């Protein structure tokens, strides 16, 4: 399949965020003609699953197929739509009333923003009408293991990927130990997802970093240390207060050291230390990054230039309620790219309805989060006893969607200028419109239990 030579709406990179600027720009113009541009040999796919759902799979063909269960059972593809849905990219100038095209495995390598036109990496020149960069981030390493040789950096996986997903799989049941480093959601899923499948299988799975405790720069110090005694009872050996000084190869083994001197053997790593906006073409597009937040530095509506937006992982934007933001969640691609995707159709929108985030560590147990979190601001958590429903199954049972979007729940509020400006859930569904509008509202409340007892937590 070749590139045409001018398109009128043309969305860089094809993932999440592309994929919903798509589906928004043909919402709005019925015949539009549109095309992603996708470095990655697939189709726009989901990747929440990769961590979560399609290791708890109890098909071995889940691997090939990618189409998982969720935890209702109901089963899904990985991909957001399938092949049918789209069109060749040769002959989209050409279809009566348009449609969306991809063109995988290329890469857009310099962007003229002048001439309104992109080159990709075969040489191929595209001219475009409107452009949306959606283009993601990039896992990180650590410098211990880019320092390491090239046998250390072939046995770690800087997890992102379906390609990824298929070789951890594969490496889950050729293996004995495996580490994962990185302490936050997906390191914590990814430990939870190996502790089962080495259950079954009898074999090691070791968590490590430098927190305190799994999720530690996000939950408060007893909702983290808690995490960490569940993701520790899935059979994960835990390791915090880690800091990885070397790596090296001995009797075909990996052996991690850490600055406090302790040492771990392991026979993979999986890197899980979150993730470097793709910004390469802000130099030839002469567009502007964002020195405090990463990514490329864009308005309330998503703009960066007249015909140029930006959209996921890779957008630093204004939010006129919460100010200047980047932000890395599914929800958020989808409703970013929703969002460009209308602007590119010239709908001038800002920024409003806040994105959600969600993470599950097994059918058990589930967390959502809305607005601005972090540990170091000041919270109020307020708990109660688990019902029999308070869990991402039983959520995931009414819906049916398990893409969300003696205390066993709460909720705990994030507060500058006592005004609740971020909200995390624990156990709790169903809820997110109410913490939505409680941060939208922006009151100060004069009694947060009072606030508690809209997300079911009484006394
Ligand atoms: C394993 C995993 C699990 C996750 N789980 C959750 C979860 O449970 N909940 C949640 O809220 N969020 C989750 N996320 C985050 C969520 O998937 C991301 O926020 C979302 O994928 C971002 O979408 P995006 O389109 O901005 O970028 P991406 O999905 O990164 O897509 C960008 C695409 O553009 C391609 N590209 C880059 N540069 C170029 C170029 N120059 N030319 C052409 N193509 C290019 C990239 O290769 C990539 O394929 C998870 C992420 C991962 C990796």
Same mark, same amino acid.
């Given at each position: 399949d070749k590139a045409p030579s001018h398109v009128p709406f043309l969305l860089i990179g094809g993932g999440t965020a592309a994929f919903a600027a798509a589906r928004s720009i043909r919402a709005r113009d019925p015949g539009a003609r549109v095309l992603i541009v996708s470095?990655?040999?697939?189709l726009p796919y989901m990747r929440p699953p990769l961590s979560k759902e399609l290791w708890f799979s109890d098909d071995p063909n889940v691997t090939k197929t990618l189409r998982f269960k969720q935890w209702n059972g109901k089963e899904r593809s990985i991909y957001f739509q399938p092949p049918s849905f789209y069109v060749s990219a040769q002959d989209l100038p050409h279809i009566e009333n348009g449609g969306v095209a991809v063109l995988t495995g290329k890469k857009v390598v310099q962007l003229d923003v002048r001439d309104n036109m992109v080159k990709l990496n075969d040489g191929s020149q595209i001219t475009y009408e409107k452009c949306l960069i959606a283009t993601g981030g990039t896992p990180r390493s650590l410098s211990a293991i880019d320092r390491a040789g090239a046998e250390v950096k072939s046995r770690t996986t800087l997890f992102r990927k379906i390609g990824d997903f298929r070789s951890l799989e594969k490496i889950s049941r050729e293996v004995k130990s495996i580490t994962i480093i990185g302490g936050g959601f997906l390191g914590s899923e990814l430990a939870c997802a190996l502790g089962r499948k080495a259950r079954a299988l009898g074999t090691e799975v070791i968590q490590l970093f430098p927190e305190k405790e799994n999720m530690g720069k996000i939950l408060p110090e007893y909702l983290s240390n808690w995490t960490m005694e569940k993701v520790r009872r899935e059979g994960v050996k835990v390791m915090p207060n880690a800091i990885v000084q070397s790596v090296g190869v001995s009797s075909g083994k990996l052996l991690i050291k850490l600055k406090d001197g302790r040492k771990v053997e392991t026979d993979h790593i999986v890197a899980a230390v979150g993730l470097e906006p793709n910004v390469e073409l802000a130099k030839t597009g002469g567009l502007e990054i964002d020195s #405090?937040?990463?990514?490329f530095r864009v308005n309330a509506e998503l703009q960066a230039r007249s015909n140029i937006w930006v959209a996921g992982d890779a957008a630093c934007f204004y939010?006129?309620?919460?100010?200047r933001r980047r932000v890395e969640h599914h929800d958020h691609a989808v409703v970013s790219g929703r969002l460009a995707g209308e602007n590119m159709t010239g709908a001038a929108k800002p920024y409003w309805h806040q994105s959600m985030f969600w993470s599950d560590l097994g059918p058990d147990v589930g967390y959502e989060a809305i607005g601005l979190? #972090?540990?170091s601001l000041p919270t109020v958590g307020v708990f109660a006893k688990a019902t029999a429903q308070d869990n991402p199954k039983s959520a995931t049972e009414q819906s049916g969607t398990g893409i969300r979007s003696d205390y066993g729940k709460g909720v705990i509020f994030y507060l500058r200028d006592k005004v609740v400006v971020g909200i995390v859930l624990w156990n709790?569904?169903?809820r997110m419109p109410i913490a939505r509008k409680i941060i939208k509202d922006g009151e100060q409340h004069e009694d947060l239990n009072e606030v508690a007892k809209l997300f079911n937590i009484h006394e």
């Open positions: 470095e990655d040999p697939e #405090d937040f990463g990514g939010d006129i309620k919460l100010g979190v #972090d540990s709790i569904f169903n």
